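chain and backbone:
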Amino acid sequence: EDIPREPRRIVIHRGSTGLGFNIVGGENGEGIFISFILAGGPADLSGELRKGDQILSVNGVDLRNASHEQAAIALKNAGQTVTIIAQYKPEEYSRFE
């Protein structure tokens, strides 16, 4: 019913407040989803990331089947320049959140 958009690339730079977003999912099923964007943080100011985006990969690492903690550690170890492939999937997001 609610067709996902195609994926896109977002590049953000880590700052003093980190990357500026939370993730949920990565348990049973559910993939990794952006659940919160910090106002003024790097994710906010990309103009691309949004709540309901599924993270498909971080710096080339496939996270489609990743556990929550695999995804959280991948994000922490991505360094200062973080390249996210994200796919807006609001219907899937709403089914579990």
The longest helix spans residues 68-76.
